[PDB]
């Protein structure tokens, strides 16, 4: 069947880390050989499994979460972490089973002048729960007055844009990230490797 690991990795446009795109994969023959053997993926980590023995398992469902972030905020994509991305935008659990992949995309996501289309959530009155989204654009009240959906003093907008230019540094450059989460339940296994 060779399910679509190309519409996820090889796509022209990606999402913003506060609106990360999730795709469900089911009833497939999954080839994890292109990934484990490829000089493109700068970051390739795997938690709960060994990356050389992936074609030997059989899960029930797979979830592919895709987004774009800075180059220095990739260490925040892991269990038991802290930061602006791991508390307000995208949070992984602690009993995590899957694999994190990340690669540079300065040629597609950058632009002379600046690409201000990728955004992050900067302000939140609490911390996200694992695998939770928050697309609300309500106004952040940090003072004594109510904001009434109107910006002003100590009433700020929580979604703020990255600044991506080609002449930036490797730490302020864009990186595209795909998180694969395997789900093995009491039901049969519909995602097995090839033979």
């Amino acid at each position: 069947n060779l399910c679509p690991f190309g519409e996820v990795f090889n796509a022209t446009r990606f999402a913003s880390v506060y609106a990360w795109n999730r795709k469900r994969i089911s009833n497939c023959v999954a080839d994890y050989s292109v990934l484990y053997n490829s000089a493109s993926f700068s970051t390739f980590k795997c938690y709960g499994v060994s990356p050389t023995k992936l074609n030997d398992l059989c899960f029930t469902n797979v979830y592919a979460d895709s987004f774009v972030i800075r180059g220095d905020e990739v260490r925040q994509i892991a269990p038991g972490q802290t930061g602006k991305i791991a508390d307000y935008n995208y949070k992984l659990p602690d009993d995590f089973t899957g694999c994190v992949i990340a690669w540079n995309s300065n040629n597609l996501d950058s632009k002379v002048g600046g690409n201000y289309n990728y955004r992050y959530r900067l302000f939140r009155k609490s911390n996200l729960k694992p695998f939770e989204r928050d697309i609300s654009t309500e106004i952040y009240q940090a003072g004594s007055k109510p904001c009434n959906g109107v910006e002003g003093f100590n009433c700020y907008f929580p979604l703020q844009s990255y600044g991506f230019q080609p002449t930036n540094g490797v730490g302020y450059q864009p990186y595209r990230v795909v998180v694969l989460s395997f789900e093995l339940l009491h039901a049969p296994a519909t995602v097995c490797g090839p033979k």
Partner: antibody, heavy 121, light 108 residues
Framework: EVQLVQSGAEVKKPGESLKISCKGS?????????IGWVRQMPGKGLEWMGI????????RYSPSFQGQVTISADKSISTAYLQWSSLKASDTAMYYC?????????????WGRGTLVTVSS | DIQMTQSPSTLSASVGDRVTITCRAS??????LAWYQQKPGKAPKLLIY???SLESGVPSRFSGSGSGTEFTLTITSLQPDDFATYYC?????????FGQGTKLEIKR
Amino acid sequence: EVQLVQSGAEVKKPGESLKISCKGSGYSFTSYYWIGWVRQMPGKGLEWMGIVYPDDSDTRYSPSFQGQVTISADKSISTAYLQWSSLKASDTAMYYCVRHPGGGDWYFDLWGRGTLVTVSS
Amino acid sequence: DIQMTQSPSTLSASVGDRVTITCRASQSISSWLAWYQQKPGKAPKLLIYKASSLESGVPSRFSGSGSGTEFTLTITSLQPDDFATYYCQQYDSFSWTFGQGTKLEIKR
């Protein structure tokens, strides 16, 4: 003025190889922009061929042209190149070099005057 | 490859009249569509991107409309410098495909 200059017209014969060039002037032309090629047959529509990033020398082709042509670049002199090994009579057409304002804006904001290629026996 | 269909193909008109052209995609391209103008002999020129945005150096009679699967281009105050060919291009996904062309004439 910001512009792209292309090599002059060309007359050729089958089998022979060919290489045409486009040079940009009026911006950060040395790199940081995708340079691509667009084909137009006599009295017909426009067909896209490919694009190239001069800095990293990346490249992206179209299926209809993958393998047939080669698209390369040179950042030193800021010049993009289109290359054929074996020509045919079908390769008779107008070719335009184009520039992307990248970063999600993948339209063509700059065009050349066009290089005419004739392939005759 | 998202396939684009233009309509009409040969559309006559007069001076000062209003004209409309349509492009149609086989899929949903939210707002990723540009319009190019091409006259005989000369190279194509950009008019509109984002399907509702104008380029610096263009008049106002040109306007764009649409989103999703059907887009339109309208020219209200037609003038001699507008009789030409028009192409719609999508830039949502690779590969990037144009239309086929919609020529304009001068009735009599």
